[PDB]
Design a protein around this ligand. Structure first.
Ligand SMILES: COc1ccc(S(=O)(=O)N(CC(C)C)C[C@@H](O)[C@H](Cc2ccccc2)NC(=O)[C@@H]2CN(c3cccc(C(F)(F)F)c3)C(=O)O2)cc1
Lengths: 99, 99
């Protein structure tokens, strides 16, 4: 689809059979989701943001269906203020900016 | 133009006699610029992201050129590591997300 920006670009994602809303976030390098359980091994990681740095859990090769488009990649889980889909998965679903 | 997301969506912006690089950021409600001493009235504000909140100065009706497209609107000035062009101005230059 084409998504305009007068409203937040929130979309439904499917991850582990669960439906969540996430923000399509071109200013985010990485996909970061709020606290949740995911299966498999994870690695402790730290990431920075506008307010400072946080600890997250890094899960690799996680399938997410984002607004009907399939991705498989890295998902960071931690105290993000909102679920964000970053460029690592935006590229997988073929998302571009146009003006 | 079309901007892919393999790398950060940085573009050249102009605010007065200052040329800067800034993210076209669909995940930002508002435009947030690095510390700069703009003329005119402002109001204090807090904005929150990954890691917590920062204190910013809200200036209204500031003209800004984004990739040679004219915009004018609210700009938040504060201790951000990166200049962020948020949705309030992305809409003014005709910016959409497409996939
Ligand atoms: C009301 O208006 C607002 C409110 C919040 C923001 S936001 O910047 O926090 N953020 C909101 C989002 C988390 C829901 C927008 C994100 O797109 C944000 C932009 C940003 C990029 C880089 C630094 C700071 C902010 N992105 C991120 O939070 C992460 C942080 N980040 C990153 C990567 C490497 C290093 C660093 C750091 F600078 F912290 F070292 C940050 C990155 O790629 O995406 C902007 C406008």
């Amino acid at each position: 689809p084409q998504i305009t920006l007068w409203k937040r670009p929130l979309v439904t994602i499917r991850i582990g059979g669960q439906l969540k809303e996430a923000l399509l976030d071109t200013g985010a390098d990485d996909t970061v989701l709020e606290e949740m359980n995911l299966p498999g091994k994870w690695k402790p990681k730290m990431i920075g943001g506008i307010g400072g740095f946080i600890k997250v859990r890094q899960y690799d090769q996680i399938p997410i269906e984002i607004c009907g488009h399939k991705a498989i990649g890295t998902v960071l889980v931690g105290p993000t203020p909102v679920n964000i889909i970053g460029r690592n998965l935006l590229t997988q679903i073929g998302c571009t900016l146009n003006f």
